[PDB]
């Protein structure tokens, strides 16, 4: 639900990844 501060090679904040995160891992802070 929370977008990351910046995009990396390992973790590109894509729409599908955020969609999966709505049930796999909500409450994940986007601060790096």
Number of helices: 1
> Got a strand count?
0
Radius of gyration: 9 Å
Note the overall shape: globular
Helix content: 25-40%
Major sheet size, sense and barrel closure: none
Order of helices and strands: H
Could you tell me how far the N terminus lies from the C terminus, measured between alpha carbons in angstroms?
15 Å
Q: Quickly give the structural class.
A: mainly alpha
Strand content: under 5%
Protein name: Vp2
Region (Disordered): 1-32
Organism: Banna virus
Biased composition (Polar residues): 1-27
Short description:
With 32 residues, the chain is mainly α. The chain contains one helix and no strands.
Descriptive labels:
part of a larger assembly; 31% helix; mainly alpha; Vp2; 1 helix; 32 residues; 1 chains
Question: What this model shows, in words?
Answer:
The PDB classes it as virus. The entry lists the keywords reovirus, intermediate state, capsid protein, complex, virus. The protein is 31% helix and 0% strand. With 32 residues, the protein is mainly alpha-helical. The longest helix is centred in the middle third of the chain and has 10 residues, at 15-24.
Annotate the secondary structure layout.
Layout lengths: L14 H10 L8
